[PDB]
């Protein structure tokens, strides 16, 4: 009678960190987009410019 | 007169175990395959990807 209940809540168990694992591992993709970006888009504004001669 | 009926009703009892008995195994086995595939197939949902270069 037991055995039957444990294996059910265990297929719980797996999908319910499979969706926490999926946010983790999406967000790092969502934000690794816009670390890029900022560190190109800052370093062209340092170092362009234009002199009057 | 009491003894015949008592074998007779016995022979019920088991029987009627024997199919108790049954449904728990068939069953136990009806989930071991779900069990297993689902913990398979969310292992390798999390675990595989591709990265840009």
């Known amino acids: 009678a037991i055995g ?3 294996l059910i809540i265990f ?3 797996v999908l319910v960190a499979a ?3 999926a ?3 999406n967000t790092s993709g969502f ?3 816009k670390a890029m970006a900022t560190g190109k888009e800052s370093t062209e504004q340092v170092a362009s410019g234009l002199l009057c001669s």
Chains 1, 2 share one sequence.
Do not use: N
Request: no cysteine; charged share 0%; hydrophobic share 75%.
């Open 19 to 21: 969706v926490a694992a």
């Open 11 to 13: 297929i719980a168990m």
């Open 31 to 33: 934000l690794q987009q």
């Open 4 to 6: 039957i209940g444990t």
């Open 23 to 25: 946010v983790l591992i």
